[PDB]
């Protein structure tokens with residue numbers, strides 16, 4: 001039948017999607033700003049469709065409950081037909097790839113370590129060997145799953161450490177993880193995706209730092225319901241945007257062009 | 263009908279696929295060794311299929327002739343039904359994605375600069391600003407296309423320089439590009455994918471070096487004919503291998519474990 005406005009599901013997480021300071025004076029998609037907001041506009045332009053940016057109701061990303069087997073977050077909204085496409089820093093993982101379609105990566109990243117400047121830690125191995133400096137991750141998401149399911153000695157030990165550490169080394173949000181690193185006087189290292197780490201390292205008060213190399217290598221992908229008709233075009237749009245150097249420009253814009261740390 | 267042995271098309275290019283020193287005494291897939299040979303074994307194991315490693319007849323990777331519109335290389339073998347899957351460092355590009363299916367990236371890379379140690383060059387911008395130190399790429403492939411189609415000022419200038427430079431700054435093979443850098447006493451810089459660059463930097467006589475950051479960000483993908491039944495399983499296998507840390511181990515094995523430069 002007739003074309004329909006594409007429902008885009010995303011989530012508020014800086015600097016990917018944020019409500020403009022003057023959002024109360026704007027409307028529709030114009031209320032938001034950020035890397036993903038810009039990416040969505042570019043994808044829509046190339047694929048030639050109108051869209052509406054919506055915020056995922058449950059505020060989750062994409063995990064399936066072991067008991068009920070129900071998918072939450074943006075993945076769930078695609079799986080159950082609540083949204084047509086998800087545009088956010090959604091990590092491409094096996095479990096998600098099995099239920100929805102992912103475009104090729106629009107951003108490359110890996111799990112990294114965030115420390116307050118001055119902390120005597122240079123790698124994950126360094127962390128695994130001690131307990132004075134506590135370390136944890138988000139209480140849900142791809143990074144936590146990485147450690148939970150890892151069979152690699154170092155990461156396996158880090159996981160066992162994390163589950164038994166007191167007080168809890170887990171945080172509910174990125175802002176919480178960042179704030180804990182900053183207020184813990186060097187006694188807390190935060191494991192998060194390099195992208196977020198690199199972003200925070202350029203924000204005042206400039207007291208955090210990304211150390212060591214990434215623990216893994218992966219990417220963020222645009223997701224659509226399995227078999228969806230938009231899948232193909234969106235995937236080609238992603239590759240096109242990357243080849244035109246558009247994606248690198250968007251990262252620079254939201255990560256470095258306005259860096260606040262020199 | 264009954265399952266059939268999967269025909270895998272690949273190409274001799276170190277350290278991805280090479281004929282063993284004692285190949286004349288071995289048979290079938292055992293005649294070859296390398297990163298891709300190992301990857302193929304792992305993919306086949308996870309997807310549960312028997313396969314035969316074959317070498318692409320025309321020795322090309324995957325480009326379409328503008329006049330005849332015929333696809334050459336491994337892409338062509340998939341497009342015309344000569345092979346069931348291609349396992350090699352095949353760069354995921356828009357033009358190829360339009361005719362065949364790619365798995366998510368099994369390796370992340372970008373175009374980089376290779377120089378003989380001592381060369382006064384730190385970036386592509388540095389190269390673009392001069393002509394004393396000649397610079398070029400392979401006479402075909404993704405890297406050449408990157409420069410040919412680029413609209414980015416610096417890369418556009420580099421391309422115009424390359425097309426008009428005398429003698430020709432292009433090479434036919436990686437080994438040729440490497441050899442030219444080594445024998446040109448610092449008067450030749452070679453533009454190639456970071457993966458090959460990092461590999462060569464660890465091989466005797468240890469006289470080359472990778473300088474500056476990558477010009478772009480992309481990946482290598484396993485390819486299958488569009489709509490192929492193996493596509494799904496192979497894609498999930500790739501993600502699984504990466505999540506198990508298997509892909510990083512394979513890179514270490516063929517790139518660094520035996521590094522010859524300290």
Ligand SMILES: C=C(C)[C@H]1CN[C@H](C(=O)O)[C@H]1CC(=O)O
Nearest residue numbers: 061089090091141142143192193
């Ligand atoms: C910001 C959040 C909660 C997301 C972003 N990508 C990951 C995901 O898609 O699971 C999560 C971060 C992480 O796991 O470190």
Ligand SMILES: C=C(C)[C@H]1CN[C@H](C(=O)O)[C@H]1CC(=O)O
Nearest residue numbers: 323351352353403404405454455
């Ligand atoms: C080694 C060769 C000729 C291949 C490997 N990947 C690229 C491709 O798939 O086109 C080519 C290298 C390059 O373009 O620098």
